[PDB]
């Protein structure tokens, strides 16, 4: 794939596709 | 997280670590 | 404010707005 | 749990203030 | 419900999430 | 330029980036 | 409403010209 | 204005209350 | 309309809106 | 990576993410 | 084709793969 | 070129079209 600058609700984004269903954890 | 994809760069792979 | 309908990013994108830098966990 | 809530009924902001740190 | 810096198309997002069917107005 | 088919914060997305500058009134009736 | 014609039907992008300032 | 106090500087959703209808 | 500055998720997101079902090439 | 469900804005924004400034063609 | 199953069914990324340059 | 003609420096709707299939 690629590595791209991921900030905001962009970052919170990505994690609910790569992580989807089983949830996750955004803590700064 | 912040300091590694935000601040540099980081791959979706990375972004496996947060999944719960 | 008003009794929002949000599904997927969406919900995951209104968590970010009301959290804010203190982060938050999501548990589906 | 609230998150199911709110996308098949409707849930407040504060109610999802329930999931912040 | 922490403040923000909200630009472009991200405080329109949260104006409507703020606001929903009571609509609103955005003027710079 | 499509025809759209636009429903909830998308909607408010397109208006943003249609009227940019201008701003615009949100009133859904 | 051309807002609610936009989501339940469709609409253009000069329509909602209409509602800029 | 709007800008003038969310974008530029910070602000809470409680004030963004002050721009609905 | 009018010109504003699109970069990123944002400015594939007008390509979006303004294309449609045709589709677009992204190709920086 | 979990399985995904994407329409509209949400598959372009997915296909942004997944292959970066390497660019891509969005052919539905 | 994997575009539409992604949107009347579903799709993984690395099919998504498939559309980069 | 084509964030060379929107991100660095802005353009306008109509000039994306000159990317669609
Ligand atoms: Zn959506
Ligand atoms: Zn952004």
Known sequence: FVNQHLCGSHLVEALYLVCGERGFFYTP | ?20
């Not at chain 2, 997280?1 to 719960?20: A, G, K, M, P, R």
């Open chain 2, 1 to 20: 997280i912040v300091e590694q994809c935000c601040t540099s760069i980081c791959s979706l792979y990375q972004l496996e670590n947060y999944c719960n």
